[PDB]
Ligand binder design. Structure first.
Ligand SMILES: [Zn+2]
Ligand SMILES: [Zn+2]
Ligand SMILES: [Zn+2]
Ligand SMILES: [Zn+2]
Lengths: 158, 176, 173, 164, 167, 157, 177, 178, 162, 171
């Protein structure tokens, strides 16, 4: 894809579930703040969404560092909302303190280089963008990390 | 895309939810049977899923005609299953007696010509495939209506009746 | 071609046979009314014209719903007129209560995505357009359903006075 | 298009009405014979007289010159047959001694340079092909009425005199 | 070449012999008149120029119709003039009432698609252009020969000009 | 941006390295059946503690425990690497190490891995994990050895 | 074109007017003799045809040297013959002692490199070709030059003398070999 | 190249050997005189340089018509000087009564259309240029032709007659015009 | 590469070790002075750095003639200062009186056509530029050791003599 | 041009004056030998031909080291011979024991990168090629007189057989 350390981070625009409702979210809304953008594969799987819950737990920890967190999968906003409104006993996520972006066109995952072209889903990926829109960190792998994410958003301010 | 009237239907294979379990589905599995293949854009929306409820309820009526009914969206099999397991009053589908196929790669939708490349979801499209794998009818709709299930069943009958007992024609018309 | 479901139907203008005379019909003539636009391959074949007879028989039924039925092949208006003026005994249509549009340039069939380019004739397509000129249904068919398109023109109108049927106990989230 | 004086005439293959029956016709069928190939815009036009009748009536005279006459329009063979079998009272042609070729794909008209592209129908065109497949005459115009069978007979003569 | 029925006719500009003097003629000069443009192979031939003299003889008939008749070959205007000066007795054309245009670059013949590439001379071709500069007739063959047919055609086109597609 | 792709064969590399005092050639095929941490850094003899490199050498055997050979990389020559190793630590230095330092003098390794900062000719701080079958599993680029250990353990269930 | 000094002259085949008749001529018809081949733009013009008349008048002096003279324009053989049959008072040439070759295809002018491509006519070119078919001299003039006939003749003689006697050579010069 | 008959000859600028010394010369120096500009392939060859010696020997007849003769090769002016000073008996020219211009860049040859492309030397082109600087004749010879010097002299007279008076015309010939 | 005798020298800009610290050195700086720009392959080699040492020693004899010398390798300015500040008993340079330019992007070596391409280091090469910016001399070979110092000295005088 | 250190030298084929006669010479005749190929601007100049003369004087010295010395300028072989045949007192070279190669097409000078494009003559350039045909040395300047022969000698020996400051040690 188009993600390059030290260059303006690839721009993005998506419908998110932000507190039970739908909002267009775009990178330019976060001018002057850090952004952790993380990608994950699929809503509603049988794997513990440790990752998503951890981030949502620590989200105010990130907000005190001047940093919003954004989750992304290829699922629609209608599926994110449903997944949030399902409780963790029937499988779901419960309420959530971070947007979940819908990447139904798959252009965000493509722009960021994390699209598993064979399967149409995102790798687990994490990107840190600074208050000026500059991509400062790239991380990509496979099976299921929030602590290092916080290390890093401090580090770039230390 | 690749869907051509009167030609072999574009091939497909997909993971589906079937009586609450994950199963792989491919067109060749249906050789010898008629197939109604219909697409819809998204699970879990606020549009009422009358089309899907109707086919599910009528599915034994299709099967009596040796026809299998398959539904498709770009959502994953995990999402389909979550939708099926969600109550109708919470916006869900409830139990269902037809496969729902996951087309997460968007290839089924591209092959059949119904992908809105903007947005990345299918148009509401419906395809009738006979027992030889030949594509015999294409329909696209703007929104659902449910006694369009009734139209699918009539066509399946019509196609099978034409395949044998000739083809209808008003009285008092002759050729040359 | 250019036909997009839920979008302004492609514009058309053609010469049609109407009441046994020629008339220039165009899309804009029909704003505020429903159009069932259907394509077929050729006039004067040995294939019984089932759908066209039926459409003309049910023509008033359609107009009693604010719907205009228009037929289309790549044959000229002269061949269409000749075809209507041929009695069904002898392979013709007899008199006819729907326009037949001439698509000699093949631009209508191209525009509506139903030109079978190898042969220069149209597939058997049916399009349903509404009073705003938005295309609301596309159907393409191997072989020759007139009652069906009639049923559909209503259920697109009770989807505007009433608002989509929906089973009992289905509510959104 | 591809038609050029003194060169091979562009090849052609089409479905024709030949004595009320459909039949494939191709240029190769006529090697060793002259061909008059005429194009006309539209079946069932009655605003003006048709040349098809005169060519049919004179077919034998062309045949005495070793020459086959072929008509072409973009109408289908079904339309060609309906026009033949239409009563003369209502403009029918009646039976014909020459083939009428269907150019529904418009490839014949395109290849011969006579497609009126804004309308999808052929201009009125007349081509004369010698027995070796070589194009010897081009005439094209946009008139609403044939022009002449007689001058096509003359030309066929003149070319065969110049051959010897 | 460029000649297409129903499209503007290929423009042309040439030096012509017009009543024993040289003149530039251009297609644009003729807007509002019909033009018959005929091409022939060679001046001073041993084949009787039956076509050119006839056009000259019938020149008034064409002018009754508002039609101009222009003959063209690849010969120069100096050859055209000498051919017109030479007596019909000793092989010439004698005086002439139609222009003869010199196509020495062979561009008129190319543009009208009548150049026999092998020989570098024109086929016998006949073109009719209406008063709006639109081409209405193309006739080309490789025979060696026509004036009454040209006269018929101009009248037929003028009729459809006035009456329309009717007849 | 280079050729490193998750789930594909990692980009091939060969370089001249410093291995416990001496120059040796390291190819990628050398580590079959073995996991590699390929880690890039910008420059030798710089003015800030080589914490990362030092950390990685100390825990070298921790990675050797896991079946994982670590491999550092900069655009500096193997002469400059050996010099750096044999400098003291005072005003600058490095000390010995139990990890190869590769010399990416051609810049082809940095380029192939997408980490070359072109306008300055040096590597970004990048780290890559490759498994015993050659397949790139992890990509990290910054501009922290504990996290690297965790990651290596995970890829083996 | 394909005219290269010191090399075989490009062959040609053309229809020519030789003493009031049409004849096919070929460069090859002239092996063993010198050829003076000259080009001019157009028959029947108002330029006095001084060089063509001079060539015609001196044609026998040329044949004494065993040299044949050929005139070329892109005019047809029918125009050439007419021009010859036209008296010089009417502006023609009168009867004529040199062939006039027709280059209606323009290939001969093109091959000899003297085709004024934007006008379709030949420059005034003059080519001297020896008895082995070798191109010995290329000349191009702007206007017709009657004195070029006298010089062509003097040059044919010089080439023939050198052919036989070798290098003319100033007194006392020797190569530095 | 750029040499067009009946158009202004291409401009040129070059160093020449004039009466034993070097002197730049350019086309505009010669406005108002005739100019025979001739090219040859190479100094110092074993080809007897008959035309250069004939032009030298007859340079005063040219000058009597106000015509300046100019020889050109791709050799340097140093080579031209040495060639002039080499005894004729060792392949030299001996003292010389016309300029030899040096064309070491190959631009005069290329502009005049006589560069033999694969060898980098000139063909023997000869160019007659009138007092108005107009290119009046192009000649190309294969070898040196002593008599091509007489020819050039007679042609220069001829052209000058034409300018004076006009082109005379045979007896009996009148155009067919009005 | 882009080096042409009698044409303006290829511009350069690089960070250098001057004395014992950093400084951007640009060609334009030297307008009006001769420049001797030499390239060598690698810092910290095991082979005696005879040519750099020699250039440093004769630095002021070069300066007498209005000419500044500059060394170049692809090594970073950090590696340069480490070499300079390493002592000669341990393979190092000791102090220098000539700037050492860092060509980490390899743009200098490419522009001067000296980049031994398949290795990424410069051949030994010497270039000489006059006060008006013109390239007057190009010398390159693949030899290990160079005695181009005396030769460079003779060449500078020569170019001024004209 | 095409001359690259460590690559095969650009091929060349030229007519040369060897011992007062013309001879074709090409790079390939020198296989197994070293070649010093030097370029100079112009024959017959007013600048004393020190380098050409010195290379001729030392030619045998080079041959004893298995090295052939070839001179090149854009002048023709006829001009070379005339220059050799002109006495040194009248500006000539006198007899010469190195080939002089004619580069009249200027392809040699272009291939080696020394053609001074505006004037069409070569820079003073000097190239050493080893017996493998590999280019080992490139030198070019615009000096009015090139002093070269001694440096060429030492270089040739240096390539054929591959000081050090104070207490400098490696590690
Ligand atoms: Zn009228
Ligand atoms: Zn004798
Ligand atoms: Zn004898
Ligand atoms: Zn002497």
């Amino acid at each position: 894809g188009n993600a390059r350390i030290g260059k303006p981070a690839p721009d993005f625009k998506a419908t998110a579930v932000v507190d039970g409702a739908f909002k267009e979210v775009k990178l330019s809304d976060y001018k002057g703040k850090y952004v952790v953008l993380f990608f994950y594969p699929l809503d509603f799987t049988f794997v513990c969404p440790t990752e998503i819950i951890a981030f949502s737990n620590r989200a105010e920890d990130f907000r005190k560092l001047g940093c919003e967190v954004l989750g992304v999968s290829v699922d629609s906003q209608f599926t994110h909302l449903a997944w949030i409104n399902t409780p963790r006993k029937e499988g779901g996520l419960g309420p959530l303190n971070i947007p979940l972006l819908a990447d139904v066109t798959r252009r965000l995952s493509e722009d960021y280089g994390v699209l598993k072209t064979d399967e149409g889903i995102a790798y687990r990926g994490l990107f840190i963008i600074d208050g000026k829109g500059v991509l400062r960190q790239i991380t990509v792998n496979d099976l299921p990390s929030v602590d290092e994410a916080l290390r890093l958003v401090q580090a770039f301010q230390y």
